[PDB]
Automatic annotation (TrEMBL), chain A:
Its main location: host cell. Mg(2+) 1 binds at D139, D183. It comes from Norovirus (isolate Mouse/NoV/United States/MNV1/2002/GV). It comes from the Viruses. This is Capsid protein VP1. GO terms for cellular component: host cell cytoplasm; virion component. The chain holds residues 228 to 530 of 541 of the full protein. Belongs to the caliciviridae capsid protein family. Residues 82-303 form the Calicivirus coat protein C-terminal domain. Mg(2+) 2 binds at Q211, D213, E220.
From TrEMBL, chain B:
GO terms for molecular function: metal ion binding. It is found in: Host cytoplasm; Virion. Keywords: Host cytoplasm, Metal-binding, Virion. This is Capsid protein VP1. It comes from Norovirus (isolate Mouse/NoV/United States/MNV1/2002/GV) (MNV-1). The chain holds residues 228 to 530 of 541 of the full protein. The keyword Cell cycle does not apply. Residues 82-300 form the Calicivirus coat protein C-terminal domain.
Amino acid sequence: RMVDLPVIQPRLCTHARWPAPVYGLLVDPSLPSNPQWQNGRVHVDGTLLGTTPISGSWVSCFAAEAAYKFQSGTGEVATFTLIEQDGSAYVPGDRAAPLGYPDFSGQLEIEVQTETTKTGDKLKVTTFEMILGPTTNADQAPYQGRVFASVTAAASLDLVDGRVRAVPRSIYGFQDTIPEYNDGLLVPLAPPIGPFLPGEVLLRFRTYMRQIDTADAAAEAIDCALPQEFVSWFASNAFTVQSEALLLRYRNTLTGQLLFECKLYNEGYIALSYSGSGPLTFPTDGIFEVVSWVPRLYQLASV
Amino acid sequence: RMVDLPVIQPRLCTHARWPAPVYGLLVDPSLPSNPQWQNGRVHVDGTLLGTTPISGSWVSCFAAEAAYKFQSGTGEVATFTLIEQDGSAYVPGDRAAPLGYPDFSGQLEIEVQTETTKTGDKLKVTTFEMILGPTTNADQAPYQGRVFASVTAAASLDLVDGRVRAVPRSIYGFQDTIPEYNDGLLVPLAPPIGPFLPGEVLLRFRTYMRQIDTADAAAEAIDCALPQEFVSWFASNAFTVQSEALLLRYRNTLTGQLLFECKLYNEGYIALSYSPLTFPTDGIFEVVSWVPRLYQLASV
Amino acid sequence: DPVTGPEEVSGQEQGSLTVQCRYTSGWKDYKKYWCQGVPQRSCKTLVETDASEQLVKKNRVSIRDNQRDFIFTVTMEDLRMSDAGIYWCGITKGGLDPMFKVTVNIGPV
Amino acid sequence: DPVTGPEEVSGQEQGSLTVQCRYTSGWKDYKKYWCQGVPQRSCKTLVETDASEQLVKKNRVSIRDNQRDFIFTVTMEDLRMSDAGIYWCGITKGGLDPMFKVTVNIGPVPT
Ligand SMILES: C[C@H](CCC(=O)NCC(=O)O)[C@H]1CC[C@H]2[C@@H]3[C@H](O)C[C@@H]4C[C@H](O)CC[C@]4(C)[C@H]3CC[C@]12C
Ligand SMILES: C[C@H](CCC(=O)NCC(=O)O)[C@H]1CC[C@H]2[C@@H]3[C@H](O)C[C@@H]4C[C@H](O)CC[C@]4(C)[C@H]3CC[C@]12C
Ligand SMILES: [Mg+2]
Ligand SMILES: [Mg+2]
Ligand SMILES: [Mg+2]
Ligand SMILES: [Mg+2]
Ligand code: NA
Ligand code: NA
């Protein structure tokens, strides 16, 4: 079967690096051209790269066996022994972390189901604070299956150890650089996105994260190369690659207007020919359609 | 094109009624046989039913223009004027609520980005409490585009009105009954799942919700008829229906062992012949052929 | 605060108990009620007035609104041991009602 | 509490300031440091001891651990106004360090 794409508008899609809707579609030459994102990375033949998961509910989340201890001056401290989010054992291998683990930096608020021994309460949802990166003094090693989080508390929360699923509540001091995967040491990583022909720039699917910011009210953008629906589409179909890249058209299904042509490289990113200096945003109610295979040197018409 | 199914194990799928992974696959004759869920409802031909959305990030969420006022004795009160989660205007029509709105009852903790005027803080994430149903004294009308939530506070949180996306943090007093969609009046609803032939029971994809429980530590289960990946798969493919139902086989991808045979009815639910029985979640669903609605299955 | 009551009230089996919920003058011509159970805003309304001073009794519970002193009085009669739990003084309004939590304890005679 | 310091401290340009971080006896043989910036646990370490009482001087920050009274003193010299912000008294350990937030204010000299 010839490679095709799901008939879904980006505005109805799921983001691949933060569990939120896709809100924007744009190119921006002023941003880093070859980001080393580890989630939202898939090959057109279906191979998942980095820590990319299948389901959008795995994105920027983790699962663990949790052990709780109270330390005066810090609060309730959680030691998370990581597990793959479906329950199967996590073994350090050719990826940076368990599938879906956050691939950005900053201080992340996470939510977990906690059980207490305090009389009159049993099940509650506790917000924890967890530093991600870029460098920490907390010795985070998700590659080895262990991370530390804490909640500021004057007395012990009296929590019972057990299994948890952690979901992200907010990001503080966001930086789009890979987190501390292995206490400062190196890990296997999906390569930087690229290369691009001269004049080609990355197409960005953008969402905005819940954030903590003491001084700035502007929304915090985060980009991914492909929406999560495209990731599971390629992973489920397992197409055969018949050339070097795919020529795509982004067109309004109602009006028929062709908005642009772009190139979907085999390695899982989309390029547009754009010479402008500033960011150019696109409507999100179009549809991507595969036109044909093209060589990597195929020259696109500029946006 | 003949109908096919995504090659994904259930344990790797997204739940369709609460934003969490699928953890369980089971049938249970002791549960209500014909649930009237409004999310996770799709026709095999691609038609979305009820409030079912395309993306798993819309499930049990909403979007709104928020207006905040402090009321002594209650706290900071939020009036949410609902909008579809992509920003398009919500118009009361043939559905119970904006797409993806929760279709269960209880007290829901929600999280929204809030902006404060207090010096030293600007952007924060505030947890609100929002009663869903089954009946409330809060006059919730998501069908009409307005719901109310509150934060218990001794003084105002000093929040700025604006647009928000609300995601579910926990459920309190969960009940699998449709919420108060219209201040007690009735709304257009997807019909109850069914019917089933004698001996056929609903196949349930199960996850467990983050919960607030003062006395019980057991997990809070919630079922859906189809995983979210199946919903968007049918919605994007828009297959042609050639009969009444499709016969499916659920087999171990490694061993090849057939675990059970089932029927996927055109209306978007799976039935098995059973007289609670849980199944492994690492199998694959494979379409065998179209079958008549009266096709009798082999019992599990 | 719009409505205040006793934090805890106790009665005896087959007996009665009385709860006084005081409110501010603005809430005179609103309906008052006595609610039971949690979650708070899905509780079962046991009895409710019609915004008058007329006594209304349903579900073993009676209520009388004093609109001169701005206090409505709730009485629970023929108490059972199962009557213990969480209750609320309520004022019916559009949206979120003014409510006050009252804990009820029951014992033998 | 493992480590305590001044919640707010002020100095003047081209001048100096001193910060005292007191700790409990159990942390004597641990490394002590002076951190800068937020998020807390991604701060830039300006100066750090080697768990001894020997004085350590970096570009403009000094640290000396008094292990009899259990106080390590941080000194910032030749202050500039860009030095204002959030700082931390730190004790190096595996995992979450004991830390104390210090807000530093800088102003000009009255003229
Ligand atoms: C107490 C929680 C349920 C509440 C919850 O946090 N739900 C997640 C959500 O609402 O998004 C339980 C229910 C099922 C549990 C998971 C499943 O049992 C599968 C798996 C089993 C592993 O031993 C531990 C991780 C992992 C993944 C478990 C983590 C804790 C979960 C998620
Ligand atoms: C302040 C937030 C961003 C932070 C946030 O809440 N992100 C969601 C998450 O992290 O899951 C902003 C950024 C983009 C906004 C959305 C988009 O502008 C689209 C849409 C526009 C409508 O006027 C209001 C709803 C809706 C859907 C907006 C709700 C508020 C959002 C989501
Ligand atoms: Mg380290
Ligand atoms: Mg910001
Ligand atoms: Mg009503
Ligand atoms: Mg429960
Ligand atoms: Na009301
Ligand atoms: Na450390």
